[PDB]
Amino acid sequence: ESNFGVDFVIHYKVPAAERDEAEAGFVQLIRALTTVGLATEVRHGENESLLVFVKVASPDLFAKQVYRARLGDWLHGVRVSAPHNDIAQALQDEPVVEAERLRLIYLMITKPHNEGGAGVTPTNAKWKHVESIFPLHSHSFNKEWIKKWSSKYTLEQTDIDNIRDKFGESVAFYFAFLRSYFRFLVIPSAFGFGAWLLLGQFSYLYALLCGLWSVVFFEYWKKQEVDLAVQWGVRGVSSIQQSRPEFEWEHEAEDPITGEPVKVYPPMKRVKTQLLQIPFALACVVALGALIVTCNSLEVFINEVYSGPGKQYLGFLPTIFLVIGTPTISGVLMGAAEKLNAMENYATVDAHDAALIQKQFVLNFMTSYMALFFTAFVYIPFGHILHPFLNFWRATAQTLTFEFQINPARISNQMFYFTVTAQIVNFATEVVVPYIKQEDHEEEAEFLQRVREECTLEEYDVSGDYREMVMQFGYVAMFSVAWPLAACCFLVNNWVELRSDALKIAISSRRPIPWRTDSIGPWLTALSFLSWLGSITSSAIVYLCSNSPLKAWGLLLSILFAEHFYLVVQLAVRFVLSKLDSPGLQKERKERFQTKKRLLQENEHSEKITREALEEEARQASIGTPEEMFWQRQRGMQETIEIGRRMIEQQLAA
Amino acid sequence: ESNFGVDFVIHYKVPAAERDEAEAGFVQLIRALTTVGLATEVRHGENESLLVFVKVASPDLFAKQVYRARLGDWLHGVRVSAPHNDIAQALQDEPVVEAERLRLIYLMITKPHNEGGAGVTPTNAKWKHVESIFPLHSHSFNKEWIKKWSSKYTLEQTDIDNIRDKFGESVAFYFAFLRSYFRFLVIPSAFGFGAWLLLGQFSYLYALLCGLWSVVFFEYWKKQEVDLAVQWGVRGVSSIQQSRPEFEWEHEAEDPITGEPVKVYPPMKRVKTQLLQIPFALACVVALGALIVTCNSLEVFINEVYSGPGKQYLGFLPTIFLVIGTPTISGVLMGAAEKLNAMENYATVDAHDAALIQKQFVLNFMTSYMALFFTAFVYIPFGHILHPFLNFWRATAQTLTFEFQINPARISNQMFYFTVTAQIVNFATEVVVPYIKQEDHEEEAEFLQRVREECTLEEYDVSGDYREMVMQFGYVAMFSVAWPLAACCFLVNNWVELRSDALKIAISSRRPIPWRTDSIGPWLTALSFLSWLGSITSSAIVYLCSNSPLKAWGLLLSILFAEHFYLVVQLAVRFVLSKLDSPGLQKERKERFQTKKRLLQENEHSEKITREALEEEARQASIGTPEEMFWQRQRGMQETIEIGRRMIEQQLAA
């Protein structure tokens, strides 16, 4: 019921057709890991694969690897404090967590021979037989962490920090983002229930309240992430770039910024294939745009010809067919989001995911809101354009079988359907995968059985759940005025999602390779664009749905005021939160000072000043006469006093 | 025709009534300067004053003071490079400019006994007799710098950098701002002449062109000021705070950020008197607002009753009376801007001027544009409100002596009057002060005569001319669509102002005390607010003056589009100028690395890994049996190879 001290496990699938190649690749593989010091053990595997097992035998090699990497961060402004002990006295001062151990094991299996490692990245030239490298999961800790989280109402700061200790900094930021979003969701939750009782449908004051809250939360989290990165000491790691393993280069570069020549790729080949997203996004506009308008017009056509024999669940049934249908059609578009992104050669693995997301978000931006956008910005202001699409469907239904009444209250029903049915099918997909999983020395067989299962588990992507919580922010920031129970219905989800995603890392995936990132990433832009867009369409909805024919005086002012209510209250909160004097920033200017105070500690009056007058009076004697005779006029300071006093009475005589 | 090596000159006016006090103060003063090492010479003065003359005699004291201050900056991240030589080998590597010399002389006369100086700040408790401390001006360099500038068409980067060498960094930023504003003025200058020929009055395309240029200039200067601060090595000096001499404190503070206890002032007493500006600004609103409406209504009343017997110069004569009258009434309001600011106890001398300016700018914001604002936002859209003020003046003129026709083209005449007549009276005031100035050992009398004049000169404030060039940007960013020759008429001024202000430091003022500031200061906000406000009222003017009755569809869209044309092109240029890879930033990451590479240089394979297996096999022998017998199953890596190969054929047998 425990591990055997193993750090990482390499899969190395061996097929039948490339048998002699994979066998010769294996002995070349197992040679390479032994040079960098990995104590190696080979075990059996399923589908005729060979799971080799690695660990660091020599601690003083391993502590030197810790001492090398801690020196490597200290050069880049990551660590303010120097190690100062070339022998392991620095390591006894600051001990290695299990995250900092496993990364430096993973660096010794991935870094090339330039950086002192055996690079066994699978996507490079040979070893296409190595399928995956993974650390084994500790089920002993894992059972406690679920149990201790499931009994807890709230999550303390020591609960989030324990995730950093064993799962890395990038995984711990997702729970630290979620917890600080779960807590900040209660403010439009409770006020979204009070606006349901008091204010009624489409109030103006809730839109100004939500557009205030979405600034206050987002500016608070940007302050909180620079405090947490100080606390884990990962502040500034985004400034470090790490080169990509599968990055291809045409030539090496000269005149570098770091100083040593780097391998580069001419951007005219990259800006060609980056321009390929412009027809790809525009086709995906008219893919999803034609898809919504053929479901939305058909849905409004069916309530006119059947007159609703069932209830309103039957009236919106293709819209329900869209929400159960969208996580499939998001799956095919994320595949084209990743193939188009890997085709573009990106330099760093930070700037590779920094442009994956702004392709991944915009594609998810279309498929999650343009169904709602067509209700409140096409159907409500002018449904006269869809009247060709209605009678076109009337041409079929008469041949098949052998008065528009545009309701302003359609979106509040539609926002209700996008809220709960997406929350059902999400919690359906977070319950069905729990329900779809449900020789050799005769001692480690149960140990080996959990490993043989763990290769079948997929990797856990942290970005796959940021994209949900950002899209969950989009319903609250933009369209929550249509149904202010959404912030009430998201808050019950974010409690269980904080324990559902804790369960998803627990049993439905292997342990991720621990990484280091300062911020959440490029989501801080996508959380900020949704906040600003949640000022315009939060005000433009409450003007239309609360509607006299609609005047452009009314819309263009209600947009301009609330969008400039945003920019004022953005500058107020940025002013206020600058003056909160965060404890992560007080310590950083402090602890930098004592290290300089260390080097500070590393390193008569009248009688002196006459001697340089004696010095210059020798040099006029050796060789001008205005300059020397000016200064030697009053030689000592006592001579300056008496002449200074006698010039007063000389003036006082006059 | 040269100085005598003197650094600073202290005035110390001695009156008749406090004669014995000032005389006893003088001997106490001249005692204090001799302790910190100032070689002292006393000379005569006018109005029965005693000009004492100071210099540093001992160079090794003075080099240690240089070595102390260079260490002081290096602790705060100012200097990337360490001095590394406690003896003066560091100083021979990087020599002292005359600016860095005079500041450290001035620090020894101002810093208290805590920081190792004799604080002789005049505004502290005793020595109210010391009037001013000033460095003497070098007329030898000064005659060359005017002559070499007056022949030059353009100013090279070595011309601006010479100002830093003798006048400090804060003075050199004003010319570096002016030169980079003079050069960026030619873009709406030439395009403002082409819009005069082609487009005519109040074009829309020029407003989008100017609102583009005002982002491109301002974002360029913000990039350029972090390059110049790197080049002078003053980058980050704003992060250093310097305490104020005249700051009063109630008690010392505990738990500090630097570590040592500081003297503080409870903010409830300061936020009381900071709230005093709210009635002060609102009264100055209705001071200047009532002042414009009683001149503007009277001016439009005089063209109706006299029918213009003279020409249009006679028609706008109270508006001309306002522009010749405003530098006087700006003088009285700047006095209340400085008395109200000094009454508020500010901590640092940086944050003292950082709130002086936003009082000084807003007060100058009212008196320079609200005359134009009432033309284009009250008179043009609805002049029906001023009709009481007309017939009120008609009640007087009939008793004195015993049909509105609102012209849309009034502002283009009025913008012409605010352009050239302000430029006349400015160049009048920059020519009239040149035209209003036009015993003792018998050797230094001509030397002493230039000093006796120089006490009568006032100090040169750098902020007094930033406020002009920011206000000059306000006419271009906001109201240049009314008269696009303004950018043509400002460009001829900014050439001569670049040599006029070079003349004003030359003869019409003493040499300023050299300081150190990273940016221009809080003008970067006031240049940025004017840029954003130059998007709204640059579009709202061209809608009204080019005008059918005016629809709120038209105004509210023309505001919303151009103001969102601003925020898009702000984010584009911030994206583009981030990717220009400025040479001031390439060197900073470079030169930081070699200093870390210095500390980097300050600090078998298979045969090792079996020994820890031999280590653990002794410890199972001393004492678990799954963990040990797993790892000692395949002891050496060659044993891992053969079992790893035989598991393949075992699988291949199956």
User: How would DSSP label each residue in A143-164?
Assistant: HHHHHHHHS-SS--HHHHHHHH
Query: Could you give the 3-state DSSP secondary structure of residue B534?
Result: helix
Q: How far apart are CA A110 and CA A130, in angstroms?
A: 13
Q: How far apart are CA B567 and CA B536, in angstroms?
A: 12
Is the dihedral angle over the CA atoms A106, A109, A112, A115 positive or is it negative?
Answer: positive
State the Cα angle at B569 between B490 and A542, rounded to 5°. Answer: 120
For residue A629, give Cα distances in angstroms to A176, A414, B10, B391. 75, 96, 20, 78
- Contact in structure between B397 and B423 (CB atoms under 8 Å): no
The CA dihedral of B298, B300, B301, B306, to the nearest 10 degrees, is 120
The angle that helices B637-653 and A19-35 make with each other, rounded to 10 degrees, is 160
Helix ranges (H only) for B75-185 are 89-93, 98-110, 139-150, 157-167, 169-182
C-alpha distances out from residue B240 to A277, A317, A589, B341, B347, Å: 47, 65, 11, 22, 13
Q: What length does chain B have? A: 654
From the list A4, A23, A600, the residue facing B626 with the nearest CB is: A4
Residue-wise burial string across B470-503, b where 16 or more C-beta atoms lie within 10 A, e elsewhere: bbbbbbbbbbbbbbbbbbbbbbebbeebbebbbb
Using CA atoms, how far apart are residues B200 and B210, in angstroms rounded to an integer? Answer: 15
CA distance A325 to A323: 5
Find, among A249, A245, A244, the residue nearest to A261 by Cα: A249
- How far apart are alpha carbons A281 and A340 in whole angstroms? 11
Does B561 touch chain A if contact means CB atoms closer than 8 Å?
no
Stretch 211-240 of chain B: residues touching chain A, C-beta under 8 Å:
none
Question: How far is the C-alpha of A351 from the C-alpha of A244, rounded, in Å?
Answer: 10
Query: Which H/E stretch holds residue B291?
Result: helix B277-305
C-alpha span between B105 and B56 (Å, rounded):
8
Q: Where are the beta strands (DSSP E) in A467-602?
A: none
B647 in contact with chain A, both atoms CB, cutoff 8 A: yes
Q: Tell me, what amino acid is at B290?
A: A
End-to-end CA distance of chain A: 105
CB contact under 8 A, A612 and B71: no
DSSP state of B581: -
> Which positions 64-103 of B are in contact with A (Cβ < 8 Å)?
71, 74-75, 86
Amino acid symbol at B271: V
* DSSP secondary structure string for all residues of B93-117: HSPPPHHHHHHHHHHHHHS-TTTTS
What is the token pair recorded at B618? 């002794």
CA torsion angle B485 B490 B492 B498 (round to 10): -170
- Between CA B296 and CA B390 the distance in angstroms is 10
- Please tell me the distance from the alpha carbon of residue B163 to that of residue B142, in angstroms, as a whole number: 11
Give yes or no for a contact between B417 and B319, defined as CB atoms under 8 angstroms apart: yes
Secondary structure class of A38 (helix, strand, coil): strand
What is the sign of the dihedral through the CA atoms of B147, B153, B156 and B160? Answer: positive
Is residue A10 within 8 A of residue A43, CB to CB? The reply is no
A490 burial level (CB within 10 Å; 0-12, 13-18, 19+): buried
- Neighbour order of strands in the sheet with B133-135: B38-42, B52-56, B8-10, B133-135
A197 CB neighbour count, 10 Å cutoff: 7
Spatial distance between the Cα atoms of A606 and A597, rounded to a whole number of angstroms: 31
User: Residue A560, Cβ neighbours under 10 Å: how many?
Assistant: 19
In this structure, which amino acid lies at residue B407? N
Amino acid symbol at A191: F
The answer to whether B171 touches B521, Cβ cutoff 8 Å, is no
Neighbours of B368 (CB within 10 A): 21
Phi, psi of A161 (to 5 degrees): -70, -20
For residue B49, what are the β-bridge partners? B13
Chain centre distance of CA B180: 14
**Residue length of chain A:** 654
Q: Which residues contact A10 (CB under 8 A, 6 or more apart)?
A: A29, A51, A52, A54, A109, A120, A130, A132, A133
Cβ density class A216-242: b for 16+ within 10 Å, e for less: bbbbebbbbbbebbbebbbbbbbebeb
Query: Which residue in the set A42, A71, A74 is minimally distant from B643, CB to CB?
Result: A42
Measured between alpha carbons, how far is A28 from A15 in angstroms, rounded to an integer?
Answer: 17
Q: Which positions ≥6 away from B617 have C-beta within 8 Å?
A: B628, B632
B51 → chain A, closest CA residue: A644
Q: Could you give the angle at which helices A637-653 and A605-622 cross, rounded to 10 degrees?
A: 90
Tokens found for residue A487: 């912030």
CA distance B626 to A443: 7
B56 touches chain A (CB under 8 A): no
CB contact under 8 A, B627 and A4: yes
Q: Is B39 on the interface with A (CB under 8 A)?
A: yes
Structure token digits, residue A472: 């969950």
Q: Do B608 and A61 touch (CB under 8 A)?
A: yes
Binding-site residues of B for Ca(2+), in ranges, read 426, 430, 465, 468, 497, 501
The Cα B365–Cα B474 span in angstroms is 9
Do B308 and B315 form a contact (C-beta atoms < 8 A)? yes
- Both tokens assigned to A621: 């004697």
DSSP structure class, residue B13: B
The C-alpha atoms of residue A83 and residue A79 are separated, in whole angstroms, by 9
Domain locations along chain A: 1-603
The answer to whether the beta carbons of residues B146 and B506 sit under 8 Å apart is yes
- Cα distances (Å, whole numbers) of residue B523 to A258, B54, B356, B364, B475: 35, 36, 11, 13, 16
DSSP β-bridge partners for residue B243: B348
Q: Could you give the 3-state DSSP secondary structure of residue B75?
A: coil
Q: Are B613 and A75 an interchain contact pair (Cβ–Cβ within 8 Å)?
A: no
C-alpha span between A601 and B470 (Å, rounded): 46
Helix (H, G, I), strand (E, B) or coil at B8: strand
Pick from A479, A372, A496, A366: nearest CA to A423: A496
Q: How many Cα atoms are found within 13 Å in the side-chain-facing hemisphere of A596?
A: 20
CA distance B152 to B179: 13
What's phi and psi for B441, nearest 5 deg?
A: 65, 10
Instruction: Give, for A8, the enclosing helix (H) or strand (E).
Output: strand A8-10
Residue A18 near residue A129, CB atoms below 8 Å: yes
Separation of alpha carbons B33 and B24, rounded Å:
15
| Distance in angstroms (rounded) separating the CA atoms of residues A462 and A465 | 6
Measured CA to CA, the distance from residue A455 to residue A451 in angstroms comes to: 7
* CA separation for the pair B429, B590 (Å, rounded): 49
Residue B516: which of B179, B132, B9, B164 has the closest Cα? B164
| Long-range Cβ contacts of A194-198 (<8 Å, 24+ apart) | A195/A484, A196/A484, A196/A485
CB contact under 8 A, B640 and A30: yes
Dist. CA B221–CA B229, nearest whole Å: 12
Count Cβ neighbours within 10 Å for each residue of B437-447 and write b for 16 or more, e otherwise: eeeeeeebeeb
Tell me whether residue B515 is exposed, middle or buried, using C-beta atoms within 10 angstroms of its C-beta: 0 to 12, 13 to 18, 19 or more: middle
Dist CA A411 CA B634 (whole Å): 67
For residue A82, give the 3-state DSSP assignment: coil
Token duo for residue B319: 């508006």
Sign of the alpha-carbon dihedral angle for A192, A197, A198, A199: positive
Contacts of range B253-258, beta carbons closer than 8 Å, 24 or more positions apart: B257/A586, B257/A589, B257/A590, B258/A589, B258/A590, B258/A593
Which amino acid type is present at position A106? Y
Other beta carbons within 10 angstroms of residue A299's beta carbon come to 18
CB crowding A448-486: b at 16 or more within 10 Å, else e: beebbebbebeebebbebbbbbbbbbbbbbbbbbbbbbb
Strands A251-252 and A133-135, sheet pairing: unpaired
Output the six-digit token pair for A640. 């300056």
Distance of CA B567 to the CA centre of its chain: 24
A403's tokens:
């008065």
Tell me how crowded residue A281 is: count the other CB atoms within 10 A of its CB: 13
Query: Does A497 appear as a known binding residue?
Result: yes
What are the tokens at B499?
Answer: 């040599």
> What percent of the residues of chain B are helix, what percent strand, and what percent coil, each to the nearest 5?
65, 5, 30
What do you get for the CA distance between the two ends of chain B, in Å? 105
CA A498 to CA A217: how far, in whole Å?
Answer: 18
- CA A8 to chain centroid, in Å, comes to 25
Q: Indicate the helix (H) or strand (E) that contains A339.
A: helix A317-343
What is the rounded CA–CA span in Å between residue A336 and residue A130?
25
Whole-angstrom distance, CA of residue B232 vs CA of residue B176: 12
Cβ neighbours around A506 below 10 Å, total: 19
Among B118, B117, B120, B114, CA closest to B260: B114
Chains A and B form CB pairs within 8 A to the count of 217
Yes or no: say if B159 and B152 are a contact pair by the CB < 8 Å rule.
yes
Query: What is the residue whose two structure tokens read 């690695």?
Result: A54
With beta carbons less than 8 A apart as the criterion, state whether B640 and A34 touch: no
**Residue A586 with chain B: CB contacts under 8 Å:** 257
Query: What span, in angstroms and rounded, lies between the C-alpha atoms of A69 and A73?
Result: 6
Q: How far is CA B343 from the centre of its chain?
A: 22
The β-bridge partners of A11 are none
- Does B428 lie at the interface with A, CB-CB under 8 angstroms? no
Instruction: Decide if B478 contacts B533 (C-beta within 8 A).
Output: yes
Q: What residues of A are in contact with residue B86 (Cβ under 8 Å)?
A: 603
Is B644–A58 a contact, with Cβ atoms under 8 angstroms apart? Answer: no
Q: Do A57 and B637 touch (CB under 8 A)?
A: no
Cβ distance of B594 and A259 shorter than 8 Å: yes
| Residue burial A623-649, b: 16+ Cβ < 10 Å; e: rest | eeeebbebbebbbebeebbebbbebbe
In angstroms, rounded to a whole number, what is the distance separating the alpha carbons of residues B301 and B315?
Answer: 10
Measured between alpha carbons, how far is residue B190 from residues A647, B177, B184, B419, B486 in Å?
A: 63, 21, 11, 17, 11
The two three-digit tokens of residue B113, written as one number: 């006994």
Instruction: State both tokens at B207.
Output: 């407003």
Where do the DSSP E strands lie in A425-512? none
**A516 neighbors A234 (Cβ within 8 angstroms):** yes
Count CB neighbours of B620 within 10 A.
Answer: 13
Residues before each break in chain B (C–N > 2.5 Å)? 402, 438, 547, 603, 623
Q: How many CB atoms lie within 10 A of CB A409?
A: 11
> Which residue's entry shows tokens 């005389």?
B23
Residue A92: which H helix or E strand, with range? helix A89-93
Nearest to B505 by CA among B152, B226, B231, B134: B134
Residue with tokens 């280091």: A516
Is position A501 annotated in a ligand binding site? yes
**Would the CA dihedral through A596, A600, A605, A607 be positive or negative?**
negative
Residue A183, helix vs strand vs coil: coil
Closest to A511 measured CA to CA, from A107, A168, A149, A45: A168
Locate all alpha helices (DSSP H) within A243-316, ordered by sequence.
267-274, 277-305, 312-315
Selected for mutation to probe chain A from B136, B609, B611, B646 (highest A CB count within 10 Å) is B609
Strand (E) or helix (H) holding A252: strand A251-252
Structure tokens at B509: 């003022």
Question: Which structure tokens are listed for B125?
Answer: 């408790």
3-class secondary structure, B56: strand
Residue to mutate among A6, A439, A640, with most B CBs inside 10 A, is A640
Q: Do B629 and A257 touch (CB under 8 A)?
A: no
Contact (Cβ atoms closer than 8 angstroms) between residue B63 and residue B49: no
Q: Please answer whether residues B46 and B174 qualify as being in contact, where contact means their C-beta atoms are separated by less than 8 angstroms.
A: no
